[PDB]
């Protein structure tokens, strides 16, 4: 299992059935697709690469800009870098980020802090919400998302 997270970023906002994203997808051996016929199956989970991909079935009411047409819109994803059981992300990160880094180094690379609390930092950079989360002092994960109405009314993005 080797997907390059930085390449996920350009499919952000695109649909379930976007040919380039579907090609990209089954190129890395996924073929799980999102559906709602059985349950709310809107995440593609890759447990031991350390990645979760999240889709919304209601892009418009959430204020998410749809790019390609379709019923499932790719809203964001989680890059997990820590877990007691296996399943972290070893591949490369955007904007020169490293799992080793500390909050201060992370801060220095993303340059645009929007909210700081005991355990998460929110940054807005290149049309994307980035949230870094810290278990203890350890970098735990990095959640990315397209702008939403929730994130707009929390003043994290415009």
């Amino acid at each position: 299992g080797t997907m390059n997270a930085i390449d996920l970023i350009d499919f952000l906002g695109h649909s379930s059935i976007y040919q380039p994203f579907d090609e990209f997808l089954t190129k890395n051996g996924v073929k799980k697709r999102p559906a709602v016929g059985k349950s709310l199956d809107t995440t593609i989970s890759l447990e031991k690469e350390g990645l979760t991909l999240r889709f919304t079935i209601k892009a418009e009411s959430e204020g998410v800009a749809q790019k390609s047409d379709g019923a499932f819109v790719f809203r964001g994803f989680e890059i997990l870098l820590l877990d007691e059981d296996g399943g972290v992300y070893t591949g490369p990160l955007p904007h020169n980020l490293k799992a080793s880094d500390s909050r201060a180094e992370i801060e220095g690379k993303l340059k645009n802090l929007k909210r700081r609390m005991p355990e998460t930092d929110a940054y807005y950079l290149d049309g994307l919400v980035y949230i870094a989360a810290f278990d203890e002092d350890r970098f735990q994960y990095l959640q990315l998302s397209v702008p939403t109405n929730l994130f707009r009314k929390n003043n994290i993005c415009p």
Partner: protein
């Protein structure tokens, strides 16, 4: 033809008590709808700066879904349900999640309006089971699962 347990209230996660008959465990409101209602709230804490892993989110969702109370009904009648199979399109899963109490009210009426006169239906037994599902505080039921799933 009445099964002994047509209309018995039972967690979705209970397979022991009803194995034997063709009874289906109907979700009112639909399982996907609770699941979205749960997610809409999780989304909001995250936007508030909460720290919730996706592992955690999926665990919560599964509890919301599989611990729901559900009413055992027979399969032909379940087929006329509002959220059966492909009837559960995104727009109806969206509207249901934005007001659970209305959703269970609509869902259980059409079940019961189609259990009329059916010999194997349990319209008497179903309506009593339905009433408590229209009255359950579903919005609470999700707040509990969320707080459990995030306590560590």
């Amino acid at each position: 033809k009445k099964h002994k347990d047509c209309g018995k209230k039972v967690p979705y996660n209970d397979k022991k008590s009803l194995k034997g008959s063709g009874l289906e465990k109907d979700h009112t409101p639909s399982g996907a709808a609770l699941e979205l209602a749960a997610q809409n709230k999780i989304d909001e804490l995250i936007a508030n700066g909460a720290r919730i892993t996706e592992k955690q989110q999926k665990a919560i969702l599964n509890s919301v879904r599989n611990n729901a109370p559900t009413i055992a009904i027979p399969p032909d009648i379940a087929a006329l349900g509002d959220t059966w199979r492909a009837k559960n399109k995104p727009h109806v899963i969206e509207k249901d999640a934005a007001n659970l109490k209305d959703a269970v009210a609509r869902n259980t009426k059409t079940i019961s309006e189609a259990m009329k006169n059916k010999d194997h239906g349990c319209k008497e037994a179903y309506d009593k089971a339905a009433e408590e599902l229209r009255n359950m505080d579903w919005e609470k039921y999700i707040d509990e699962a969320i707080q459990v799933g995030t306590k560590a």
